[PDB]
Amino acid sequence: SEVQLVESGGGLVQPGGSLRLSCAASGFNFSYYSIHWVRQAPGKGLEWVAYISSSSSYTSYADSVKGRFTISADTSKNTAYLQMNSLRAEDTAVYYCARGYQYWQYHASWYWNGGLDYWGQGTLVTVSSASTKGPSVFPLAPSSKSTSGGTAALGCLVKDYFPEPVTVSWNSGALTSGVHTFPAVLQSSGLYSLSSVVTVPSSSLGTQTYICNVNHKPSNTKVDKKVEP
Amino acid sequence: VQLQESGGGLVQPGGSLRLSCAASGRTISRYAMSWFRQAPGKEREFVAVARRSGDGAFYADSVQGRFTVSRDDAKNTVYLQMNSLKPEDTAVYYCAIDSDTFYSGSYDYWGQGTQVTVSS
Amino acid sequence: GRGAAAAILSLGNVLNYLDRYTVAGVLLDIQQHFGVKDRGAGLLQSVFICSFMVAAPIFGYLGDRFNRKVILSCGIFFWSAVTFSSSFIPQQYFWLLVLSRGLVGIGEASYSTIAPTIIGDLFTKNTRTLMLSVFYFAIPLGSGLGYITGSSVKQAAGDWHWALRVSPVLGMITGTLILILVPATSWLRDMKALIRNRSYVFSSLATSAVSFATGALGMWIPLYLHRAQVVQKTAAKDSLIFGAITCFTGFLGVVTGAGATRWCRLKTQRADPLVCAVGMLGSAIFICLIFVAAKSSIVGAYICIFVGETLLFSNWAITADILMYVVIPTRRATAVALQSFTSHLLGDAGSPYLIGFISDLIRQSTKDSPLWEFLSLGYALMLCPFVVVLGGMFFLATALFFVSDRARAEQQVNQLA
Amino acid sequence: QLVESGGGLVQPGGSLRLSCAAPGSRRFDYYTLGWFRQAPGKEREGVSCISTVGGITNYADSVKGRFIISRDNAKSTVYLQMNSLEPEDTAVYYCAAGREMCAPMMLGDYYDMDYWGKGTPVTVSS
Amino acid sequence: IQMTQSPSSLSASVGDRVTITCRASQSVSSAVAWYQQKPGKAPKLLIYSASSLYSGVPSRFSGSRSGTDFTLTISSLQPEDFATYYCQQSSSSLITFGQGTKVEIKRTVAAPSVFIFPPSDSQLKSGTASVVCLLNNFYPREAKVQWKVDNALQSGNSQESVTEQDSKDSTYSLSSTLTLSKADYEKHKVYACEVTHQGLSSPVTKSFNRGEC
Ligand SMILES: CCCCCCCCCCc1ccc(-c2noc(CCCN)n2)cc1
R_g (Cα) of chain D, nearest Å: 14
For E208, name the nearest residue in chain A, comparing CA atoms only.
A145
Interchain contact, D102 vs C417, CB within 8 Å: no
Answer for the pair C87, C104: CB distance below 8 angstroms, yes or no: no
The number of distinct structural domains making up chain C is 2
- Please tell me which of the candidates D40, D87, D125 has its beta carbon nearest to residue E48: D40
What distance in angstroms lies between residue C74's CA and the mean position of ligand 1's atoms? 24
Identify the H or E element spanning E115.
strand E113-117
Q: Which CATH number fits domain E4-104: 2.30.30.140, 2.60.40.1180, 1.10.150.120, 2.60.40.10?
A: 2.60.40.10
Q: Which of A112, A192, A198 to probe the E interface (max E CBs under 10 A)?
A: A112
Q: Residue E36 and residue E30: Cα distance in Å, rounded?
A: 20
Contact D123 A111 (CB under 8 A): yes
Tell me if C373 sits within 8 A of C363, measured CB to CB. yes
Give the number of other CB atoms < 10 A from CB of residue E163: 14
Distance A152 CA to ligand 1 centre (A): 98
Neighbours of chain C (3+ CB pairs under 8 A): D
For A126, phi then psi, to 5°, come to: -120, 130
Give the mutation target among C132, C139, C305, C338 for probing the ligand 1 site: most ligand atoms within 8 A of CB.
C139
Instruction: State the structure-solving technique.
Output: cryo-EM
Contact at CB, A45 and E100, closer than 8 angstroms: yes
Task: State which ligand 1 atom lies nearest to the alpha carbon of C305.
Answer: 1
- Asked if C276 contacts C397 with a C-beta cutoff of 8 angstroms, the reply is no
Do C136 and C190 fall into the same domain? no
Q: Report the distance separating Cα D1 and Cα B43, nearest Å.
A: 83
SS3 of chain A: CCCEEEEECCEEECCCCEEEEEEEEECCCHHHCCEEEEEECCCCCEEEEEEECCCCCCEEECCCCCCCEEEEEECCCCEEEEEEECCCHHHCEEEEEEECCCCCCCCCCCCCCCCCCCECCCEEEEECCCCCECCEEEEECCCCCCECCCEEEEEEEEEEEECCCEEEEEHHHCCCCCEEECCCEECCCCCEEEEEEEEEECCHHHHCCCEEEEEECCCCEEEEEECCC
Burial of C175 per CB tally in 10 Å (0-12, 13-18, 19+): buried
**Residue A113 Rama label (left phi>0; alpha psi -120 to 50; beta):** left
Pairing of strands E18-23, E4-6: antiparallel
CATH of domain A4-127: 2.60.40.10
Beta strand extents in chain D (DSSP E only): 3-5, 9-10, 15-21, 34-38, 45-50, 57-59, 67-72, 77-83, 91-97, 115-116, 120-124
Chain mean position to CA A170: 25
Q: How far apart are CA C389 and CA C194, in angstroms?
A: 26
Sign for the CA dihedral angle at C388, C389, C394, C395 comes to positive
* Interatomic CA distance for residues C301 and E21, integer angstroms: 84
Phi, psi of B72 (to 5 degrees): -145, 110
User: C-contacting residues of D 65-84, CB under 8 Å?
Assistant: none
Same domain membership, residue C198 and residue C157:
no
Residues written for chain C: 417
Nearest partner of C373 among C393, C390, C356, judged by Cα: C356
Q: Return phi, psi of residue C393, to 5°.
A: -70, -25
Q: What is the CATH number of the domain that holds C56?
A: 1.20.1250.20
Write out chain C residues lying below 8 Å of D112, CB-based. 125
Residue B10 host element (H or E): strand B9-11
Residue E166 per-residue DSSP state: P
Mutation for testing the E interface, residue in A46, A110, A137, A194 having most E CBs under 10 Å: A46
Distance between CA B60 and CA B44 in Å, rounded?
A: 13
Tell me the shortest Cα–Cα distance from E102 to chain D, in angstroms. 26
Nearest to D95 by CA among D13, D29, D20, D17: D20
CATH code, domain carrying D20 = 2.60.40.10
Chains E and B touch (3+ CB pairs under 8 A): yes
Sign of CA dihedral D93, D99, D101, D107: negative
Return the percent helix, strand and coil in chain D, to nearest 5: 0, 40, 55
Domain boundaries, chain A: 4-127, 136-226
The answer on C264 and C323 residing in a single domain is: yes
Which domain does B10 fall in, by range?
2-118
Pairing of strands D91-97, D34-38: antiparallel
**Residues in A touching E122 (Cβ below 8 Å):** 138-139
Contact A110 E31 (CB under 8 A): yes
Tell which one of C143, C207, C306, C386 to mutate to probe ligand 1, the residue whose CB is within 8 A of the most ligand atoms: C143
Q: Does A58 touch chain D (CB under 8 A)?
A: no
Kindly report the three-state secondary structure assignment for every residue of chain C.
CHHHHHHHHHHHHHHHHHCCCCCHHHHHHHHHHHCCCHHHHHHHHHHHHHHHHHHHHHHHHHHHHCCCHHHHHHHHHHHHHHHHHHHHCCCCCCHHHHHHHHHHHHHHHHHHHHHHHHHHCCCCCCCHHHHHHHHHCCHHHHHHHHHHHHHHHHHHHCCHHHHHCCHHHHHHHHHHHCCCCCCCCCHHHHHHHHCCCHHHHHHHHHHHHHHHHHHHHHHHHHHHHHHHHHHCCCCCCCHHHHHHHHHHHHHHHHHHHHHHHHHHCCCCCCHHHHHHHHHHHHHHHHHCCHHHHCCCCCHHHHHHHHHHHHHHHCCCCCHHHHHCCCCCCCCCHHHHHHHHHHHHHCCCCCHHHHHHHHHHHHHCCCCCCHHHHHHHHHHHCCHHHHHHHHHHHHHHHHHHHHHHHHHHHHHHHHHHC
Residue ranges per domain, chain E? 4-104, 113-209
- The range of the structural domain enclosing residue D45 comes to 3-124
**DSSP bridge pairs for E102:** E9, E84
Q: Report the top-level CATH class of A136-226.
A: mainly beta
Q: How far is CA D17 from CA C6, C204, C238, D6, D20, in A?
A: 50, 46, 68, 6, 11
Q: What are phi and psi of C290, to 5 degrees?
A: -60, -45
Cβ atoms within 10 Å of A185's Cβ, excluding its own: 15
Neighbours of B90 (CB within 10 A): 16
Is C272 found in the same domain as C256?
Answer: yes
C-beta of C143 in contact with ligand 1 (< 6 A)? yes
Residues C105 and C54 in one domain: yes
CB A104 within 8 A of CB A34: yes
Q: Do C266 and D28 touch (CB under 8 A)?
A: yes
Contact (CB, 8 A) for C207 and C319: yes
Cα angle: A26, vertex A28, A32; to 5 degrees: 125
User: CA nearest D41 in A: which residue?
Assistant: A117
DSSP E139: B
- On whether both C9 and C141 belong to a single domain, the answer is yes
Domain boundary among C153, C185, C217: C185
Residues C220 and C87 reside in one and the same domain: no
- Give the residue numbers spanning the domain of C163: 1-185
- CA dist D44 and D93 (Å) reads 10
Q: Does D90 touch chain C (CB under 8 A)?
A: no
Taking every pair of Cα atoms in chain D, the longest distance, rounded to a whole number of angstroms, is 42
The b-or-e profile of C67-80 (16+ CB within 10 A means b, else e) is ebbebbbebbbbbb
- State whether E45 and D40 contact (CB < 8 Å): yes
Resolution in A: 3.2
Q: What is the dihedral of CA E47, E48, E50, E51, to 10 degrees?
A: -70
A11-13 and A123-127: which strand pairing? parallel
Give chain D's domain count: 1
* All partners of chain B with 3 or more CB pairs under 8 angstroms: E
Burial C3-27 (b: 16+ CB within 10 A, else e): eebbeebbebbbbbbbbbbbbbbbb
Number of domains into which chain B is organized: 1
CATH of the domain at B61: 2.60.40.10
Residue D84 main-chain phi, psi, to 5 deg: 55, 60
Domain boundaries E113-209, corresponding CATH code: 2.60.40.10
